[PDB]
Fold Orotidine 5'-monophosphate decarboxylase.
Amino acid sequence: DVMDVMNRLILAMDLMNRDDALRVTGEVREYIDTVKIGYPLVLSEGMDIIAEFRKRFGCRIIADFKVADIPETNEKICRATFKAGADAIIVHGFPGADSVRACLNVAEEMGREVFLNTEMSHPGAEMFIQGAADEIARMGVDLGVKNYVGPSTRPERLSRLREIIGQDSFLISPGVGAQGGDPGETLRFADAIIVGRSIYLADNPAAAAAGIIESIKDLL
Amino acid sequence: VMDVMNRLILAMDLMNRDDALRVTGEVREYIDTVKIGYPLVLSEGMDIIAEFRKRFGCRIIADFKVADIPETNEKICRATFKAGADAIIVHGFPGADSVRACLNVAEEMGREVFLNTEMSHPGAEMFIQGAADEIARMGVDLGVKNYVGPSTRPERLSRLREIIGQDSFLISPGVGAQGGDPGETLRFADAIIVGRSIYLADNPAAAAAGIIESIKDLL
Ligand SMILES: O=c1cnn([C@@H]2O[C@H](COP(=O)(O)O)[C@@H](O)[C@H]2O)c(=O)[nH]1
Ligand SMILES: O=c1cnn([C@@H]2O[C@H](COP(=O)(O)O)[C@@H](O)[C@H]2O)c(=O)[nH]1
């Protein structure tokens, strides 16, 4: 019983202008039904943008807020985020189990999902995150987390994450395209890929999305 | 370093504009520095920063625990400074590139970065504590001048002060509701952050005045 992402492709909509964000999302709407919205767009245009996306596209919204505070603050962040209409929120595991549990509680209260970020995809992740990543994944399993995020840029690490969480858990993966990750290789392990700049900075975002999907058509 | 009145920073985590403004107004004679985080910002919008600047003579620290990849961190910092925040708080666990991205924007934009080195809640023991000394040392190497460390662990706060040196600026949450003591915390931190002990009080002004009275010899 997991999220069903059209074409295994999640748009990372990190444009910071409302008109551009709506236009570009509109251009690729035939290809997706899931949009990841983060702080670049929300802090520039307000949390009301989430409801607007739902009104215009009916798409699922994952709030990529990298939640990383103490439990009582995490609870408030999740509540405000779900009140705005997000279907799911992404939370860091590095701050520990109590901080993750706070998010799980609010998600269960409001009919939403928590995604646990286990290993980030950028070079700096090697310094502290990578050494904790397997343990963070096991912590997710212990807590009953069913949704995870891991790195397209390190398919061996993404594979290990998939091993830890099992085939039943849901796994999404950013770092495809601009950061160097490959769509098809990433989908060997992840249920869905997250793609931002490769699509939203493209001269023709629709063609960019279509091209990515063409490259993975055998993977559905 | 920023000159924090009474060594006391209000953590304004009420989620309703009217309540947040009322409480902040009530304690304005005691503070000139307010920490605004996502509970309030996600409820009322980034224009809440503008509103606080208009209503109060307060510096604004945006406690956004910035914790993304460098390119996204840059965007978050730009949006936050554009809205009028004096400073932003960032995490170090995502690594040096992620911190450097924030520092670069702050330098370009004439604002400040605070690095959170060790959080004050129990879960911090699992992963954060073991990385904290290195995160602090990384901050020093990167040129970070402003830091956050935990009131709830005096021994850890003392070690973090040692690492960053006496010239760095250190603020510390976990005072009051989380169990930290104002006076003991100020042995090491330049200023204490206080939220619920003030903002949930029947009389927030009396609560702030009481905390200040308890540390008067340190002012
Ligand atoms: O470990 C990571 C790496 N990137 N991202 C996010 O995924 C998107 C990647 O976008 P991109 O395709 O433009 O690189 C951005 O929103 C970035 O913050 C994560 O959530 N986790
Ligand atoms: O390690 C920590 C612990 N708490 N906080 C923040 O400081 C405030 C503590 O508020 P309190 O006095 O109500 O506990 C809240 O905004 C919390 O998110 C931090 O930034 N870092």
User: Anything to note?
Assistant: The domain at 1-220 of chain A is CATH 3.20.20.70 (TIM Barrel). The pocket of 6-AZA uridine 5'-monophosphate (ligand 2) is lined by residues A 69-70, 73; B 11, 13, 37, 63, 116, 119-120, 148, 150, 173-174, 176-178, 193-197 (CB under 6 Å).
